[PDB]
């Protein structure tokens, strides 16, 4: 329905799962997309699977890599013109309690999940402000940004940080009339090939004491809320949290 | 883009402002709509202004009127077939502190804003469960369901009640596999003819200490999040709060 | 330790369970207390069990009874001097989903849990403002004011209302320099003789998927946070939610 | 009133302002206290100002220094016996928007405000679990852990992280019956000599659009909620947020 007419989007971690579904729906709604990922083998195949290079390209990048962020925005503008939309979706997890998190685990996870979002959000504001683009920064901030999980200590830290840092950025962009919105999306458990690779994971996640709907979601569940937030339909939404979680946080 | 293909929606307080914009966008996305309002003069004109009777009709009703709710669902099903979608949007305000709220003011506001939402949500679950409709109940729950305002005491009570009652309903519908989702929408300040009728109101609401964007929203800002929530795009969203407020609650 | 030196407190539903523990600790900290309850047999015994009439008295009252509230404040002032402290603790529950809540059940529960808190808060502001009392209104607002429960629909409505209405009152009292604070306390599951009377209830409430500590609390757990909020120790706390829940809402 | 009978507390950033008031009230309530700070000149004077070495000592430490944390717990146990209580209060601020935060500023602030809290919380769980101490970890998590401020981007990130990381730790300690509680305290604006050193700061913070009480708090306002959380009075409170903010976040 051309809901993203003329938009130019960067999606980090766009080569798999949630990020790939966001990229797919963004292209279907008329956006030009640059997806990122660490593995050129995966990324080259992923871009080609979604569309032609006039619609979607791949840029190899680890979101923790500060200087690569500059190269990524330049490559996207060279391909598609000025960037309007950034989805900070790249993330990793550590399955440790706070008590059992090694400092190396802590720093590695924060480098991707927190520094990556900071670097992308900071650079995005510089590059997308004051251009009449209807710019939108969408930060993936998890149900683990609202509630704790005893075995996700560092992940919880990262997602709580993204949640409130995003409000700061939203406010500064609003008060300065930058034409940049910043919002967070908080997925509950989502079925991906990686969940499928973990025996018993989907069944545990689908128990009513975890997800009240009694099943987990699917990548397009997160793609559709991202289309809304990237579109001009959400021009009055900034500094807000959007939860799509099968009821996980309602109980 | 036919995002509400085959849906049949009731929108309370659908004859003006936010409700009328929700009705307009619902019809544009392929839903059949029954709007309600207290004033037959307003409602007859409003339905005709949006579309033909095959698309949209009006039913006169005060949401505080329990027995009229049954008549409303029957009229909608007679016109359009089984109801899939309920937007509990009808509301009133009292400009009083808790200290200065009369008991008559308290009961009148709660009858519309809280009993109306309860009556609609209860009846909606009975009528829309277990039919494969992809049913969705959307309760208007305000930024005043998140933060207090010293001059909106009864309104705050009503909107806090809608916020958490809606989570209860969401959970019961999820746990029982009813195929009914329940979510809340929380508008910030929105420009309507009624705001326009109050000298200085929009300017006060647009101060940066109130709305960081420095302007208020427009009825379509609430219509678009309602289209998402009424659509099957939001099939994994239940028990969630969706804020569209220009940054009001982010600071 | 005389933490409530000179305070004069009304505790609704003060004759049993949580309310009786709040009354007991208030008297131990030097407050003069008027407890209320519906049953003169229970209330007369309860006051005598805590202390002598110079320390604590009983006033028979249903918190839903608007005109009795005036009589209650007058009786307390006659016994002990001007009221400084109000704990709106009286409440009832209905074990019904929203879907299965009768209108009679809905209205009865809201009359106690919501009208009672409104009547007490409104009257308290009138009677306790501008007297240098360090006045404090503490509204019992439940974990069910934060999360839904599929079988507590009306209770959830009432507790969400108390949560946000209390912020309105807090703000108006702060902005007008009334020397009245308003805060909410949100108990998780608490062991009382009434829980003991329900076979299997404590075991269900103690499951790790409900209360992560693996046991439920005890009335003094709520008494101690109420002493803090009634005391001048909390003179900068207003409009805040205080949760004491064994981790229920943290997951 | 000996509310912290037998407790042994570490307070980071305990040599000034809020931390020094927490230390002062902890000693008055019968706790043995080790305060930390970066400056031996300040810390030696601060410990002596509160009490004698049998009551309170100073240990020089930057909370960002991982290996110093081990030395700090050993010194405290050598002086006073096993540590029961940790207040992670040390923090710094950067007055920059996300847009204008340098990477050096970002990393320095996160090293103190986030790594320091992680290091202290992790080590505290190892050292204070399974000893019958009634152990309590209290993490300073700010009103800036709830709302954004356009000029506190990195600070907001750090305080959001502390808020949700603390819930993870609370849950793991509860589920494993470690006899360790973890909670967060969220001060609003508090008058300290450092605020006094910034011309116009207190007046800006006291505007009704910032702090509804129309004045800022005082260090003892944070000390008293910390006494409650360190005491066995709060034995059912874990994973909770305690806000003391003059109404800042209620509007
Ligand atoms: Mg890849
Ligand atoms: Mg559970
Ligand atoms: Mg918000
Ligand atoms: Mg939960
Ligand atoms: Mg009308
Ligand atoms: Mg939710
Ligand atoms: Mg009684
Ligand atoms: Mg608050
Ligand atoms: Mg120092
Ligand atoms: Mg303001
Ligand atoms: Mg909690
Ligand atoms: Mg606010």
mmCIF file with all atom_site columns, C-alpha atoms in Angstrom, chain B residues 8-186:
data_model
loop_
_atom_site.group_PDB
_atom_site.id
_atom_site.type_symbol
_atom_site.label_atom_id
_atom_site.label_alt_id
_atom_site.label_comp_id
_atom_site.label_asym_id
_atom_site.label_entity_id
_atom_site.label_seq_id
_atom_site.pdbx_PDB_ins_code
_atom_site.Cartn_x
_atom_site.Cartn_y
_atom_site.Cartn_z
_atom_site.occupancy
_atom_site.B_iso_or_equiv
_atom_site.pdbx_formal_charge
_atom_site.auth_seq_id
_atom_site.auth_comp_id
_atom_site.auth_asym_id
_atom_site.auth_atom_id
_atom_site.pdbx_PDB_model_num
ATOM 1   C CA . UNK B 1 8   ? -17.060 -5.242  11.236 1.00 0.00 ? 8   UNK B CA 1
ATOM 2   C CA . UNK B 1 9   ? -16.401 -2.488  13.785 1.00 0.00 ? 9   UNK B CA 1
ATOM 3   C CA . UNK B 1 10  ? -18.394 -0.634  16.468 1.00 0.00 ? 10  UNK B CA 1
ATOM 4   C CA . UNK B 1 11  ? -16.845 2.731   17.424 1.00 0.00 ? 11  UNK B CA 1
ATOM 5   C CA . UNK B 1 12  ? -18.408 4.447   20.437 1.00 0.00 ? 12  UNK B CA 1
ATOM 6   C CA . UNK B 1 13  ? -18.318 8.226   20.314 1.00 0.00 ? 13  UNK B CA 1
ATOM 7   C CA . UNK B 1 14  ? -17.653 7.763   16.572 1.00 0.00 ? 14  UNK B CA 1
ATOM 8   C CA . UNK B 1 15  ? -19.610 10.851  15.421 1.00 0.00 ? 15  UNK B CA 1
ATOM 9   C CA . UNK B 1 16  ? -16.915 13.493  16.221 1.00 0.00 ? 16  UNK B CA 1
ATOM 10  C CA . UNK B 1 17  ? -13.187 14.119  16.557 1.00 0.00 ? 17  UNK B CA 1
ATOM 11  C CA . UNK B 1 18  ? -10.994 11.066  17.273 1.00 0.00 ? 18  UNK B CA 1
ATOM 12  C CA . UNK B 1 19  ? -13.890 8.578   16.929 1.00 0.00 ? 19  UNK B CA 1
ATOM 13  C CA . UNK B 1 20  ? -14.937 10.024  13.547 1.00 0.00 ? 20  UNK B CA 1
ATOM 14  C CA . UNK B 1 21  ? -11.309 9.814   12.246 1.00 0.00 ? 21  UNK B CA 1
ATOM 15  C CA . UNK B 1 22  ? -11.093 6.158   13.429 1.00 0.00 ? 22  UNK B CA 1
ATOM 16  C CA . UNK B 1 23  ? -14.404 5.484   11.601 1.00 0.00 ? 23  UNK B CA 1
ATOM 17  C CA . UNK B 1 24  ? -13.160 7.283   8.441  1.00 0.00 ? 24  UNK B CA 1
ATOM 18  C CA . UNK B 1 25  ? -9.867  5.335   8.265  1.00 0.00 ? 25  UNK B CA 1
ATOM 19  C CA . UNK B 1 26  ? -11.631 2.051   9.172  1.00 0.00 ? 26  UNK B CA 1
ATOM 20  C CA . UNK B 1 27  ? -14.026 2.482   6.188  1.00 0.00 ? 27  UNK B CA 1
ATOM 21  C CA . UNK B 1 28  ? -11.055 3.450   3.918  1.00 0.00 ? 28  UNK B CA 1
ATOM 22  C CA . UNK B 1 29  ? -9.327  0.162   4.973  1.00 0.00 ? 29  UNK B CA 1
ATOM 23  C CA . UNK B 1 30  ? -12.401 -1.959  4.084  1.00 0.00 ? 30  UNK B CA 1
ATOM 24  C CA . UNK B 1 31  ? -14.167 -2.308  7.476  1.00 0.00 ? 31  UNK B CA 1
ATOM 25  C CA . UNK B 1 32  ? -17.949 -1.995  7.883  1.00 0.00 ? 32  UNK B CA 1
ATOM 26  C CA . UNK B 1 33  ? -18.558 0.492   10.733 1.00 0.00 ? 33  UNK B CA 1
ATOM 27  C CA . UNK B 1 34  ? -21.323 1.282   13.186 1.00 0.00 ? 34  UNK B CA 1
ATOM 28  C CA . UNK B 1 35  ? -20.617 4.625   14.924 1.00 0.00 ? 35  UNK B CA 1
ATOM 29  C CA . UNK B 1 36  ? -22.446 5.633   18.115 1.00 0.00 ? 36  UNK B CA 1
ATOM 30  C CA . UNK B 1 37  ? -23.181 8.990   19.711 1.00 0.00 ? 37  UNK B CA 1
ATOM 31  C CA . UNK B 1 38  ? -25.821 10.618  21.933 1.00 0.00 ? 38  UNK B CA 1
ATOM 32  C CA . UNK B 1 39  ? -27.280 13.055  19.305 1.00 0.00 ? 39  UNK B CA 1
ATOM 33  C CA . UNK B 1 40  ? -29.183 11.674  16.313 1.00 0.00 ? 40  UNK B CA 1
ATOM 34  C CA . UNK B 1 41  ? -28.738 15.040  14.468 1.00 0.00 ? 41  UNK B CA 1
ATOM 35  C CA . UNK B 1 42  ? -24.918 14.713  14.698 1.00 0.00 ? 42  UNK B CA 1
ATOM 36  C CA . UNK B 1 43  ? -24.769 10.952  14.080 1.00 0.00 ? 43  UNK B CA 1
ATOM 37  C CA . UNK B 1 44  ? -27.000 10.828  10.987 1.00 0.00 ? 44  UNK B CA 1
ATOM 38  C CA . UNK B 1 45  ? -24.888 13.616  9.380  1.00 0.00 ? 45  UNK B CA 1
ATOM 39  C CA . UNK B 1 46  ? -21.578 11.979  10.458 1.00 0.00 ? 46  UNK B CA 1
ATOM 40  C CA . UNK B 1 47  ? -22.336 8.515   8.956  1.00 0.00 ? 47  UNK B CA 1
ATOM 41  C CA . UNK B 1 48  ? -23.460 10.114  5.609  1.00 0.00 ? 48  UNK B CA 1
ATOM 42  C CA . UNK B 1 49  ? -20.254 12.299  5.567  1.00 0.00 ? 49  UNK B CA 1
ATOM 43  C CA . UNK B 1 50  ? -18.024 9.164   5.717  1.00 0.00 ? 50  UNK B CA 1
ATOM 44  C CA . UNK B 1 51  ? -19.783 6.773   3.328  1.00 0.00 ? 51  UNK B CA 1
ATOM 45  C CA . UNK B 1 52  ? -22.952 5.007   2.180  1.00 0.00 ? 52  UNK B CA 1
ATOM 46  C CA . UNK B 1 53  ? -25.047 2.775   4.467  1.00 0.00 ? 53  UNK B CA 1
ATOM 47  C CA . UNK B 1 54  ? -23.376 -0.384  3.015  1.00 0.00 ? 54  UNK B CA 1
ATOM 48  C CA . UNK B 1 55  ? -20.087 0.992   4.547  1.00 0.00 ? 55  UNK B CA 1
ATOM 49  C CA . UNK B 1 56  ? -21.108 2.916   7.693  1.00 0.00 ? 56  UNK B CA 1
ATOM 50  C CA . UNK B 1 57  ? -24.226 3.479   9.813  1.00 0.00 ? 57  UNK B CA 1
ATOM 51  C CA . UNK B 1 58  ? -25.101 5.353   13.030 1.00 0.00 ? 58  UNK B CA 1
ATOM 52  C CA . UNK B 1 59  ? -26.724 3.989   16.206 1.00 0.00 ? 59  UNK B CA 1
ATOM 53  C CA . UNK B 1 60  ? -27.835 6.449   18.930 1.00 0.00 ? 60  UNK B CA 1
ATOM 54  C CA . UNK B 1 61  ? -26.520 5.302   22.335 1.00 0.00 ? 61  UNK B CA 1
ATOM 55  C CA . UNK B 1 62  ? -24.972 6.605   25.550 1.00 0.00 ? 62  UNK B CA 1
ATOM 56  C CA . UNK B 1 63  ? -22.152 4.139   26.437 1.00 0.00 ? 63  UNK B CA 1
ATOM 57  C CA . UNK B 1 64  ? -23.306 4.325   30.134 1.00 0.00 ? 64  UNK B CA 1
ATOM 58  C CA . UNK B 1 65  ? -26.646 2.684   29.024 1.00 0.00 ? 65  UNK B CA 1
ATOM 59  C CA . UNK B 1 66  ? -26.185 -1.064  29.723 1.00 0.00 ? 66  UNK B CA 1
ATOM 60  C CA . UNK B 1 67  ? -29.321 -2.372  27.929 1.00 0.00 ? 67  UNK B CA 1
ATOM 61  C CA . UNK B 1 68  ? -28.619 -0.225  24.800 1.00 0.00 ? 68  UNK B CA 1
ATOM 62  C CA . UNK B 1 69  ? -25.316 -2.144  24.324 1.00 0.00 ? 69  UNK B CA 1
ATOM 63  C CA . UNK B 1 70  ? -27.265 -5.336  23.449 1.00 0.00 ? 70  UNK B CA 1
ATOM 64  C CA . UNK B 1 71  ? -29.418 -3.359  20.928 1.00 0.00 ? 71  UNK B CA 1
ATOM 65  C CA . UNK B 1 72  ? -26.211 -1.830  19.434 1.00 0.00 ? 72  UNK B CA 1
ATOM 66  C CA . UNK B 1 73  ? -24.503 -5.226  18.805 1.00 0.00 ? 73  UNK B CA 1
ATOM 67  C CA . UNK B 1 74  ? -27.753 -6.624  17.288 1.00 0.00 ? 74  UNK B CA 1
ATOM 68  C CA . UNK B 1 75  ? -28.190 -3.598  14.981 1.00 0.00 ? 75  UNK B CA 1
ATOM 69  C CA . UNK B 1 76  ? -24.555 -3.874  13.811 1.00 0.00 ? 76  UNK B CA 1
ATOM 70  C CA . UNK B 1 77  ? -24.805 -7.619  13.119 1.00 0.00 ? 77  UNK B CA 1
ATOM 71  C CA . UNK B 1 78  ? -28.146 -7.070  11.254 1.00 0.00 ? 78  UNK B CA 1
ATOM 72  C CA . UNK B 1 79  ? -26.482 -4.390  9.038  1.00 0.00 ? 79  UNK B CA 1
ATOM 73  C CA . UNK B 1 80  ? -23.018 -5.935  8.478  1.00 0.00 ? 80  UNK B CA 1
ATOM 74  C CA . UNK B 1 81  ? -22.787 -9.474  9.961  1.00 0.00 ? 81  UNK B CA 1
ATOM 75  C CA . UNK B 1 82  ? -20.928 -10.556 13.119 1.00 0.00 ? 82  UNK B CA 1
ATOM 76  C CA . UNK B 1 83  ? -18.947 -7.841  14.938 1.00 0.00 ? 83  UNK B CA 1
ATOM 77  C CA . UNK B 1 84  ? -15.137 -8.393  14.918 1.00 0.00 ? 84  UNK B CA 1
ATOM 78  C CA . UNK B 1 85  ? -13.902 -5.086  16.337 1.00 0.00 ? 85  UNK B CA 1
ATOM 79  C CA . UNK B 1 86  ? -14.939 -2.748  19.186 1.00 0.00 ? 86  UNK B CA 1
ATOM 80  C CA . UNK B 1 87  ? -13.390 0.663   19.839 1.00 0.00 ? 87  UNK B CA 1
ATOM 81  C CA . UNK B 1 88  ? -14.505 1.954   23.265 1.00 0.00 ? 88  UNK B CA 1
ATOM 82  C CA . UNK B 1 89  ? -13.810 5.644   22.520 1.00 0.00 ? 89  UNK B CA 1
ATOM 83  C CA . UNK B 1 90  ? -16.812 7.471   24.102 1.00 0.00 ? 90  UNK B CA 1
ATOM 84  C CA . UNK B 1 91  ? -15.716 9.598   27.070 1.00 0.00 ? 91  UNK B CA 1
ATOM 85  C CA . UNK B 1 92  ? -16.350 12.773  29.026 1.00 0.00 ? 92  UNK B CA 1
ATOM 86  C CA . UNK B 1 93  ? -14.162 14.987  31.214 1.00 0.00 ? 93  UNK B CA 1
ATOM 87  C CA . UNK B 1 94  ? -14.652 16.968  34.415 1.00 0.00 ? 94  UNK B CA 1
ATOM 88  C CA . UNK B 1 95  ? -12.165 19.837  35.028 1.00 0.00 ? 95  UNK B CA 1
ATOM 89  C CA . UNK B 1 96  ? -11.935 19.347  38.802 1.00 0.00 ? 96  UNK B CA 1
ATOM 90  C CA . UNK B 1 97  ? -9.266  18.266  41.273 1.00 0.00 ? 97  UNK B CA 1
ATOM 91  C CA . UNK B 1 98  ? -10.117 15.196  43.387 1.00 0.00 ? 98  UNK B CA 1
ATOM 92  C CA . UNK B 1 99  ? -10.665 17.688  46.275 1.00 0.00 ? 99  UNK B CA 1
ATOM 93  C CA . UNK B 1 100 ? -13.327 19.637  44.308 1.00 0.00 ? 100 UNK B CA 1
ATOM 94  C CA . UNK B 1 101 ? -15.050 16.733  42.460 1.00 0.00 ? 101 UNK B CA 1
ATOM 95  C CA . UNK B 1 102 ? -18.736 16.485  43.458 1.00 0.00 ? 102 UNK B CA 1
ATOM 96  C CA . UNK B 1 103 ? -20.111 12.971  43.908 1.00 0.00 ? 103 UNK B CA 1
ATOM 97  C CA . UNK B 1 104 ? -22.588 13.629  41.052 1.00 0.00 ? 104 UNK B CA 1
ATOM 98  C CA . UNK B 1 105 ? -19.635 14.582  38.743 1.00 0.00 ? 105 UNK B CA 1
ATOM 99  C CA . UNK B 1 106 ? -17.689 11.498  39.896 1.00 0.00 ? 106 UNK B CA 1
ATOM 100 C CA . UNK B 1 107 ? -20.572 9.069   39.212 1.00 0.00 ? 107 UNK B CA 1
ATOM 101 C CA . UNK B 1 108 ? -21.509 10.668  35.832 1.00 0.00 ? 108 UNK B CA 1
ATOM 102 C CA . UNK B 1 109 ? -17.936 10.513  34.506 1.00 0.00 ? 109 UNK B CA 1
ATOM 103 C CA . UNK B 1 110 ? -17.371 6.935   35.757 1.00 0.00 ? 110 UNK B CA 1
ATOM 104 C CA . UNK B 1 111 ? -20.705 5.843   34.173 1.00 0.00 ? 111 UNK B CA 1
ATOM 105 C CA . UNK B 1 112 ? -19.453 6.845   30.679 1.00 0.00 ? 112 UNK B CA 1
ATOM 106 C CA . UNK B 1 113 ? -15.686 6.353   30.934 1.00 0.00 ? 113 UNK B CA 1
ATOM 107 C CA . UNK B 1 114 ? -15.521 3.228   33.124 1.00 0.00 ? 114 UNK B CA 1
ATOM 108 C CA . UNK B 1 115 ? -18.944 1.487   33.068 1.00 0.00 ? 115 UNK B CA 1
ATOM 109 C CA . UNK B 1 116 ? -19.206 2.115   29.305 1.00 0.00 ? 116 UNK B CA 1
ATOM 110 C CA . UNK B 1 117 ? -15.832 0.464   28.660 1.00 0.00 ? 117 UNK B CA 1
ATOM 111 C CA . UNK B 1 118 ? -16.695 -2.424  31.037 1.00 0.00 ? 118 UNK B CA 1
ATOM 112 C CA . UNK B 1 119 ? -20.136 -2.990  29.408 1.00 0.00 ? 119 UNK B CA 1
ATOM 113 C CA . UNK B 1 120 ? -18.643 -2.875  25.882 1.00 0.00 ? 120 UNK B CA 1
ATOM 114 C CA . UNK B 1 121 ? -15.647 -5.073  26.736 1.00 0.00 ? 121 UNK B CA 1
ATOM 115 C CA . UNK B 1 122 ? -17.801 -7.675  28.594 1.00 0.00 ? 122 UNK B CA 1
ATOM 116 C CA . UNK B 1 123 ? -20.434 -7.868  25.832 1.00 0.00 ? 123 UNK B CA 1
ATOM 117 C CA . UNK B 1 124 ? -17.738 -7.838  23.123 1.00 0.00 ? 124 UNK B CA 1
ATOM 118 C CA . UNK B 1 125 ? -16.026 -10.902 24.614 1.00 0.00 ? 125 UNK B CA 1
ATOM 119 C CA . UNK B 1 126 ? -19.372 -12.780 24.746 1.00 0.00 ? 126 UNK B CA 1
ATOM 120 C CA . UNK B 1 127 ? -20.273 -11.863 21.123 1.00 0.00 ? 127 UNK B CA 1
ATOM 121 C CA . UNK B 1 128 ? -16.815 -11.970 19.372 1.00 0.00 ? 128 UNK B CA 1
ATOM 122 C CA . UNK B 1 129 ? -15.085 -15.039 20.996 1.00 0.00 ? 129 UNK B CA 1
ATOM 123 C CA . UNK B 1 130 ? -14.579 -18.393 19.246 1.00 0.00 ? 130 UNK B CA 1
ATOM 124 C CA . UNK B 1 131 ? -15.726 -17.222 15.753 1.00 0.00 ? 131 UNK B CA 1
ATOM 125 C CA . UNK B 1 132 ? -12.382 -17.007 13.862 1.00 0.00 ? 132 UNK B CA 1
ATOM 126 C CA . UNK B 1 133 ? -12.977 -13.240 13.393 1.00 0.00 ? 133 UNK B CA 1
ATOM 127 C CA . UNK B 1 134 ? -9.520  -12.092 14.573 1.00 0.00 ? 134 UNK B CA 1
ATOM 128 C CA . UNK B 1 135 ? -11.466 -10.019 17.108 1.00 0.00 ? 135 UNK B CA 1
ATOM 129 C CA . UNK B 1 136 ? -9.969  -6.886  18.675 1.00 0.00 ? 136 UNK B CA 1
ATOM 130 C CA . UNK B 1 137 ? -11.206 -4.666  21.509 1.00 0.00 ? 137 UNK B CA 1
ATOM 131 C CA . UNK B 1 138 ? -9.409  -1.298  21.632 1.00 0.00 ? 138 UNK B CA 1
ATOM 132 C CA . UNK B 1 139 ? -9.997  0.776   24.783 1.00 0.00 ? 139 UNK B CA 1
ATOM 133 C CA . UNK B 1 140 ? -9.178  4.499   24.802 1.00 0.00 ? 140 UNK B CA 1
ATOM 134 C CA . UNK B 1 141 ? -7.165  4.886   28.043 1.00 0.00 ? 141 UNK B CA 1
ATOM 135 C CA . UNK B 1 142 ? -5.437  8.336   27.718 1.00 0.00 ? 142 UNK B CA 1
ATOM 136 C CA . UNK B 1 143 ? -2.015  9.635   28.786 1.00 0.00 ? 143 UNK B CA 1
ATOM 137 C CA . UNK B 1 144 ? -4.171  10.357  31.914 1.00 0.00 ? 144 UNK B CA 1
ATOM 138 C CA . UNK B 1 145 ? -4.054  6.568   32.488 1.00 0.00 ? 145 UNK B CA 1
ATOM 139 C CA . UNK B 1 146 ? -0.254  6.864   33.031 1.00 0.00 ? 146 UNK B CA 1
ATOM 140 C CA . UNK B 1 147 ? 0.227   10.234  34.775 1.00 0.00 ? 147 UNK B CA 1
ATOM 141 C CA . UNK B 1 148 ? -1.929  12.375  37.015 1.00 0.00 ? 148 UNK B CA 1
ATOM 142 C CA . UNK B 1 149 ? -3.238  15.849  36.240 1.00 0.00 ? 149 UNK B CA 1
ATOM 143 C CA . UNK B 1 150 ? -4.210  17.914  39.294 1.00 0.00 ? 150 UNK B CA 1
ATOM 144 C CA . UNK B 1 151 ? -7.414  19.147  37.550 1.00 0.00 ? 151 UNK B CA 1
ATOM 145 C CA . UNK B 1 152 ? -8.574  15.757  36.083 1.00 0.00 ? 152 UNK B CA 1
ATOM 146 C CA . UNK B 1 153 ? -9.061  13.639  39.248 1.00 0.00 ? 153 UNK B CA 1
ATOM 147 C CA . UNK B 1 154 ? -12.130 11.598  38.159 1.00 0.00 ? 154 UNK B CA 1
ATOM 148 C CA . UNK B 1 155 ? -10.804 11.341  34.579 1.00 0.00 ? 155 UNK B CA 1
ATOM 149 C CA . UNK B 1 156 ? -7.491  9.945   35.913 1.00 0.00 ? 156 UNK B CA 1
ATOM 150 C CA . UNK B 1 157 ? -9.438  7.384   38.014 1.00 0.00 ? 157 UNK B CA 1
ATOM 151 C CA . UNK B 1 158 ? -11.437 6.289   34.933 1.00 0.00 ? 158 UNK B CA 1
ATOM 152 C CA . UNK B 1 159 ? -8.378  5.986   32.639 1.00 0.00 ? 159 UNK B CA 1
ATOM 153 C CA . UNK B 1 160 ? -6.249  4.091   35.183 1.00 0.00 ? 160 UNK B CA 1
ATOM 154 C CA . UNK B 1 161 ? -9.189  1.671   35.595 1.00 0.00 ? 161 UNK B CA 1
ATOM 155 C CA . UNK B 1 162 ? -9.513  1.150   31.807 1.00 0.00 ? 162 UNK B CA 1
ATOM 156 C CA . UNK B 1 163 ? -5.745  0.592   31.545 1.00 0.00 ? 163 UNK B CA 1
ATOM 157 C CA . UNK B 1 164 ? -5.559  -2.322  34.019 1.00 0.00 ? 164 UNK B CA 1
ATOM 158 C CA . UNK B 1 165 ? -9.095  -3.764  33.486 1.00 0.00 ? 165 UNK B CA 1
ATOM 159 C CA . UNK B 1 166 ? -8.091  -4.153  29.786 1.00 0.00 ? 166 UNK B CA 1
ATOM 160 C CA . UNK B 1 167 ? -5.053  -6.282  30.816 1.00 0.00 ? 167 UNK B CA 1
ATOM 161 C CA . UNK B 1 168 ? -7.361  -8.582  32.828 1.00 0.00 ? 168 UNK B CA 1
ATOM 162 C CA . UNK B 1 169 ? -9.641  -9.052  29.817 1.00 0.00 ? 169 UNK B CA 1
ATOM 163 C CA . UNK B 1 170 ? -6.638  -9.549  27.469 1.00 0.00 ? 170 UNK B CA 1
ATOM 164 C CA . UNK B 1 171 ? -5.243  -12.294 29.717 1.00 0.00 ? 171 UNK B CA 1
ATOM 165 C CA . UNK B 1 172 ? -8.541  -14.187 30.143 1.00 0.00 ? 172 UNK B CA 1
ATOM 166 C CA . UNK B 1 173 ? -9.168  -14.080 26.344 1.00 0.00 ? 173 UNK B CA 1
ATOM 167 C CA . UNK B 1 174 ? -5.578  -15.271 25.629 1.00 0.00 ? 174 UNK B CA 1
ATOM 168 C CA . UNK B 1 175 ? -5.589  -18.088 28.223 1.00 0.00 ? 175 UNK B CA 1
ATOM 169 C CA . UNK B 1 176 ? -9.005  -19.364 26.955 1.00 0.00 ? 176 UNK B CA 1
ATOM 170 C CA . UNK B 1 177 ? -8.026  -19.142 23.218 1.00 0.00 ? 177 UNK B CA 1
ATOM 171 C CA . UNK B 1 178 ? -11.043 -16.883 22.569 1.00 0.00 ? 178 UNK B CA 1
ATOM 172 C CA . UNK B 1 179 ? -9.495  -15.226 19.422 1.00 0.00 ? 179 UNK B CA 1
ATOM 173 C CA . UNK B 1 180 ? -10.113 -11.822 21.082 1.00 0.00 ? 180 UNK B CA 1
ATOM 174 C CA . UNK B 1 181 ? -7.309  -9.321  21.767 1.00 0.00 ? 181 UNK B CA 1
ATOM 175 C CA . UNK B 1 182 ? -7.689  -6.378  24.153 1.00 0.00 ? 182 UNK B CA 1
ATOM 176 C CA . UNK B 1 183 ? -5.330  -3.389  24.046 1.00 0.00 ? 183 UNK B CA 1
ATOM 177 C CA . UNK B 1 184 ? -5.354  0.246   25.162 1.00 0.00 ? 184 UNK B CA 1
ATOM 178 C CA . UNK B 1 185 ? -4.572  3.396   23.183 1.00 0.00 ? 185 UNK B CA 1
ATOM 179 C CA . UNK B 1 186 ? -3.333  6.443   25.120 1.00 0.00 ? 186 UNK B CA 1
#
